[PDB]
Amino acid sequence: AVKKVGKIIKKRTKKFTRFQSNRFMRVKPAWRKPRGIDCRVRRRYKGTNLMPSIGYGSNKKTKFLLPNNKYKYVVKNVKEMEPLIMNHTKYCVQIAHNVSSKKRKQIIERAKQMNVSVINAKARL
Amino acid sequence: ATRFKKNRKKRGHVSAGHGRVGKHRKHPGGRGKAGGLHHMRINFDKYHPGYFGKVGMRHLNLLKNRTYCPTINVDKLWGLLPEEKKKEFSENKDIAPVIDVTRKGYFKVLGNGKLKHNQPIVVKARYFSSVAEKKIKAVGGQCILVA
Amino acid sequence: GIALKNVGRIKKHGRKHLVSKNPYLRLLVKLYNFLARRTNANFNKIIAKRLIMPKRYRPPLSLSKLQYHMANHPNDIAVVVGSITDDKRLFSLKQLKVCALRFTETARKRIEDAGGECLTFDQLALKYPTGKKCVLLRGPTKARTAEKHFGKAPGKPKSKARPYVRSKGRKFEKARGRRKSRAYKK
Amino acid sequence: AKSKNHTNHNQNRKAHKNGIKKPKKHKFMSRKGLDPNFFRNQKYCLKGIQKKKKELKLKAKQEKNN
Amino acid sequence: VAHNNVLPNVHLHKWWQRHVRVNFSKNIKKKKRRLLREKRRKANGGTPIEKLH
RNA sequence: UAAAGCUAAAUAUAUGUAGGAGACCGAUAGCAAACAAGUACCGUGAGGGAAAGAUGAAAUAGUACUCAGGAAUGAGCAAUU
RNA sequence: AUUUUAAAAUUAUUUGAAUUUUUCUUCUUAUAAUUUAAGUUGUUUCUAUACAGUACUUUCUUAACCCACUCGUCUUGAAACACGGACCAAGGAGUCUAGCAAAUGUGCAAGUGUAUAUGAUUCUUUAAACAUUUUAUACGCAUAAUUAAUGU
RNA sequence: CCUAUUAGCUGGUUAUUUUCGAAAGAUCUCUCAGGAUCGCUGGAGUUGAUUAAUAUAAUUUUACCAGGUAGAGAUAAUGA
RNA sequence: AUUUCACUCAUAUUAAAUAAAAUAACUCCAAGUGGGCCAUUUUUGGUAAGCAGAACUGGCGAUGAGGGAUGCUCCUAACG
RNA sequence: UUACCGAUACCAAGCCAUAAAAAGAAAGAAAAAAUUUUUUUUUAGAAUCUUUUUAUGAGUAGAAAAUCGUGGGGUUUGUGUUGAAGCGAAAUACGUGAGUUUUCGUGGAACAUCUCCCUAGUGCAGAUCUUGGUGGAAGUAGCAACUAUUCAAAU
Numbered sequence A: 001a002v003k004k005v006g007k008i009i010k011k012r013t014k015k016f017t018r019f020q021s022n023r024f025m026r027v028k029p030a031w032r033k034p035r036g037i038d039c040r041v042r043r044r045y046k047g048t049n050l051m052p053s054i055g056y057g058s059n060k061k062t063k064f065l066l067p068n069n070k071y072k073y074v075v076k077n078v079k080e081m082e083p084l085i086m087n088h089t090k091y092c093v094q095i096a097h098n099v100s101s102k103k104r105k106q107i108i109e110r111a112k113q114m115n116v117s118v119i120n121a122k123a124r125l
Numbered sequence B: 001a002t003r004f005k006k007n008r009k010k011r012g013h014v015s016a017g018h019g020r021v022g023k024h025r026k027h028p029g030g031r032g033k034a035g036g037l038h039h040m041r042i043n044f045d046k047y048h049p050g051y052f053g054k055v056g057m058r059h060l061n062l063l064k065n066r067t068y069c070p071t072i073n074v075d076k077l078w079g080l081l082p083e084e085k086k087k088e089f090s091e092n093k094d095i096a097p098v099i100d101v102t103r104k105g106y107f108k109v110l111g112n113g114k115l116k117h118n119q120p121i122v123v124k125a126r127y128f129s130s131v132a133e134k135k136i137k138a139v140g141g142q143c144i145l146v147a
Numbered sequence C: 001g002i003a004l005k006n007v008g009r010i011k012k013h014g015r016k017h018l019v020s021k022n023p024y025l026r027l028l029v030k031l032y033n034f035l036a037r038r039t040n041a042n043f044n045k046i047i048a049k050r051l052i053m054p055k056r057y058r059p060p061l062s063l064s065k066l067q068y069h070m071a072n073h074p075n076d077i078a079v080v081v082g083s084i085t086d087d088k089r090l091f092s093l094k095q096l097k098v099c100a101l102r103f104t105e106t107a108r109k110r111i112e113d114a115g116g117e118c119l120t121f122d123q124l125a126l127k128y129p130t131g132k133k134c135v136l137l138r139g140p141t142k143a144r145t146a147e148k149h150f151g152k153a154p155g156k157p158k159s160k161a162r163p164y165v166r167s168k169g170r171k172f173e174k175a176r177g178r179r180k181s182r183a184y185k186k
Numbered sequence D: 001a002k003s004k005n006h007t008n009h010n011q012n013r014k015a016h017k018n019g020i021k022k023p024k025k026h027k028f029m030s031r032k033g034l035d036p037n038f039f040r041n042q043k044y045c046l047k048g049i050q051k052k053k054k055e056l057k058l059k060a061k062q063e064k065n066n
Numbered sequence E: 001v002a003h004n005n006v007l008p009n010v011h012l013h014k015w016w017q018r019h020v021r022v023n024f025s026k027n028i029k030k031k032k033r034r035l036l037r038e039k040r041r042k043a044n045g046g047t048p049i050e051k052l053h
Numbered sequence F: 001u002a003a004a005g006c007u008a009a010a011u012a013u014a015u016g017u018a019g020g021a022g023a024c025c026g027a028u029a030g031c032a033a034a035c036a037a038g039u040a041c042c043g044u045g046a047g048g049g050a051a052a053g054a055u056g057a058a059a060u061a062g063u064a065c066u067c068a069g070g071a072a073u074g075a076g077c078a079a080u081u
Numbered sequence G: 001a002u003u004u005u006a007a008a009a010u011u012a013u014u015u016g017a018a019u020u021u022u023u024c025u026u027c028u029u030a031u032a033a034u035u036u037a038a039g040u041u042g043u044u045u046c047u048a049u050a051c052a053g054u055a056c057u058u059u060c061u062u063a064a065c066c067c068a069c070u071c072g073u074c075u076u077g078a079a080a081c082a083c084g085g086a087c088c089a090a091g092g093a094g095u096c097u098a099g100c101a102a103a104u105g106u107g108c109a110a111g112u113g114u115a116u117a118u119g120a121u122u123c124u125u126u127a128a129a130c131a132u133u134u135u136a137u138a139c140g141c142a143u144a145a146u147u148a149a150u151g152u
Numbered sequence H: 001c002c003u004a005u006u007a008g009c010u011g012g013u014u015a016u017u018u019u020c021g022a023a024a025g026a027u028c029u030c031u032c033a034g035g036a037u038c039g040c041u042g043g044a045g046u047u048g049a050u051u052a053a054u055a056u057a058a059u060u061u062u063a064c065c066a067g068g069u070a071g072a073g074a075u076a077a078u079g080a
Numbered sequence I: 001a002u003u004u005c006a007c008u009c010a011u012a013u014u015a016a017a018u019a020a021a022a023u024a025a026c027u028c029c030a031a032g033u034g035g036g037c038c039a040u041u042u043u044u045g046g047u048a049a050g051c052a053g054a055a056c057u058g059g060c061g062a063u064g065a066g067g068g069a070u071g072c073u074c075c076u077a078a079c080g
Numbered sequence J: 001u002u003a004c005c006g007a008u009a010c011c012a013a014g015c016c017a018u019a020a021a022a023a024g025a026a027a028g029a030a031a032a033a034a035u036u037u038u039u040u041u042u043u044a045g046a047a048u049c050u051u052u053u054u055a056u057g058a059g060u061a062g063a064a065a066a067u068c069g070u071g072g073g074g075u076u077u078g079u080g081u082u083g084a085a086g087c088g089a090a091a092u093a094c095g096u097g098a099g100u101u102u103u104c105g106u107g108g109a110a111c112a113u114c115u116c117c118c119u120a121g122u123g124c125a126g127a128u129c130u131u132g133g134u135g136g137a138a139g140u141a142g143c144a145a146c147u148a149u150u151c152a153a154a155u
Ligand SMILES: [Mg+2]
Pocket: A012, A013, A014
């Protein structure tokens, strides 16, 4: 159903799973549009899988915000996070997956001095 | 570039754009120009009407260098001269230019257009037409035959 | 439901944007869109539209026809959204003022030797904001050879269309269907 | 096996998809094969009229520019 | 055939693949030719390698 | 100016041998064959014809000793890295 | 950051006329305020004097109530007593060349395209790039059509 | 080996969202399980309208025209 | 006939009504189709048929939702 | 004759996309908390762009645009023994969607580029598809010609 926390509204939370992916294991769950005569999902029979459509789209004013109510930016070194000193209230940072611990300590320490929040500041400790 | 080809848009569709009921088969109407005059007749008649049959005399060993002949009209005849040179002749009145068109690659002078009034000009060539030669004479010029 | 045609949606048919990636042409389009919007003059609208058309609808115009069109408009400015070419069939050229998109070297030289001048569209936008004493002209849009193949098919009665043939001669498509002597003409 | 051999079912729905088109309403038509001995005389009349008009216009031009 | 197109003419009905020739070394060969006719000049020892026509 | 004769260069090279290189393939791919490959194997014969790469820096470190068991093998307080 | 303005309504003092003769009677004929104009504002309590708890967010598992025939294909018509499919991993199908046209982008324009070659103080790359023979007739397409044809 | 001979005939033909949207009539064909051509559809482009107008209309009204089906007749023609 | 000059013929209520009438008109390049079937009314062959063959319109096909217990074509009504 | 129940159709309101429309290329201070000075938030101007308004949304064969991912190339600017690619289980995560991104574990040497471009042997559920591996059947069918075996001892 509809989920609403603050001013952010999500029209649906469940995923769209591929038709017949629960019955055959060679069929992966990622959504593919059904083509083919006599399908019962392409023809919108009641009681089966639903199709995704543009109607479920999100409000333009709140489209990429996290529950933090900020946008996400991914950084790879200390210098890449220079632009965040001017807009430190609309953005939060996340550290890339393949940076070492030594680099991560420096990134976290600078992010604290800039008053910007870090999403995942507990990895590799 | 294969990046931009149409077939990539049909890549998840069954029939690749050719149809469920009528397939894509191999030569379902003949090969090349096969069925003309039998079952391709309408196309042949409305797009290439005079196609069938023969007309005219034979010429057994042609040798095209015997009749080669490029032409020029009298319009482009004052334009072979530089503009500053064209200016000088229109000013002075007791001199006229003598132009040899064979040195420029033309063989026959042809008679379309209008020469300037009262501006004599002398033209050398291999062949002339009647109207061209009349127009050259009218403004006070002269034609000369060369070989 | 409801009984509309095209689900109530209005339809348009022409070209909507530039295709060309030339930066100077994009600057010109921006400038003349602004002029057309803020001074709706029916002169800037037509110009702003014409410099978006494809190549086949911006034909060249020669010097002789340029002079002939301006014969009764002395001390006026002619505006063309194509190119000007030279004409060796003219003997003499007058003094003219012309604005256009491109000039060929010979035409540009001939114009300036007679006391005239050549303008670009950013100069005409600066001196004639609303096109006072300016005359819009265009060249022949249906003189291209491709147009000689269009229309009624060659084979219908009384059609003027050219056919697509390998070459030209007595042996190439002149026998049956082109003379009464072989079963019918055309 | 036999088959159908005629129907014009669905033909005027196709006819009305792009409507019933109409003739063009031009102002002049060609007099190629129509009544002769009458249009040749008309050619002479129009040549005379054009001669008079052009001569008056040319004379006016000649005196105006002097 | 079906449209307003010119009637096809291509002369590919035999085994045409066996003799196709791509020219990958035209500039290499002109370098070689230039070097050979330059070598002849040093062997002449002053006299030219051209003849009067 | 026939019914006799000779002659270098500019041209070609899916063969053999040597050298260099690529917006090429990366062990079901690329030659059939990255390995004792026209080999093992099949057919009276003409002929047909595969599968199969990788411990570690070093084995000039490839598993010493004890207990149980006929052995194979297992376990350890015992052992290389 | 200047139309949530103007106007309209209301309330309390007013400048004048009506009539329906009145504590909602009319006519913005003068100033102030307010909203019924000009799309929701306020007061208390809890979460809580917390740092992850049994509370809140989230993902799985298992019930209920209503509903739900096997996909792909040919066919007027498929859940079919029509055919293919025991399962899983890798591989697997509109491409290349010639020749023509239309559309569109680019350059020059009565012209346009430096062919084969040659030249150079080009030579790892470079099999690329650069150049053109010290009133200027290589060739193609275009600049003129038409006829069996002498031709014009 | 020529040779990956040829098949108007069976089988298959791989990511998403958005927008528009059919034909199963007709002419010719050693043609009837095929093809070419018209019609139906998509995409490009120009000319127009943007002025509660004009062009326009699977609709009415006013004026005029053409018809031999339902019905009727058999004492009017023909045939019963 | 044609051509040139004079005068003049309702408009704002538009030479009768009404109109999400310009979503118009015209060129170019192409796809897929060319086995159909069903219902009311009209209608041919046949004793008749869920038989065979035509006409106008609406549908099924290409289309799901509520109702008819059930049902490709019936009734309401077409889909972010 | 009344009341009532009943759609994805009707009406009022929000949001997504599509189509059309009204405009825009000259820039300046608002609030709250604390005592007449401090502290927070904002102070905008990207033209296929930015504000605002109305109507609309079914689809086989078929057609178009925008977008997502793969092996290589040029350009820019990056990660890695303080652990790369790969793989397993996941997430108060983002997106209508294909998919991006991140955590813990295993692993032991390489891996990107979304700044913009170039290029192709570039995307699988089926073809009695090709090669390899593995099931239920199942501890089941079966281990029946040729007359026949027994007692004690050695190893
Ligand atoms: Mg979601």
